[PDB]
Design a protein around this nucleic acid. Structure first.
Length: 51
RNA sequence: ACGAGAACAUACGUUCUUUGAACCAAGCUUCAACUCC
């Protein structure tokens, strides 16, 4: 009766979940030999391309 | 040359007073953002 636990997940392999977003080939992604992929925030980029 | 001739069943008067359409009641249940190239 009402046994509460604390499930601790330790990823052995890679864990990926959902998102609802498909970031395109050009949309906010930059990878080079320093091996990072910065994601640019969404509306600030186009409101900075406004000016 | 009528038991007749005259004579308003009329006057005054709130269908009114008191009163919760209330009470009890989860928009919830089961549900992988996933699948295949």
């Amino acid at each position: 009766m009402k046994k509460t636990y604390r499930v601790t997940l330790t990823a052995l392999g890679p864990i990926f979940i959902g998102g609802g977003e498909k970031l395109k080939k050009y949309e906010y992604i930059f990878d080079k030999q320093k091996k990072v992929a910065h994601m640019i925030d969404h509306t600030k980029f186009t409101k900075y391309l406004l000016e």
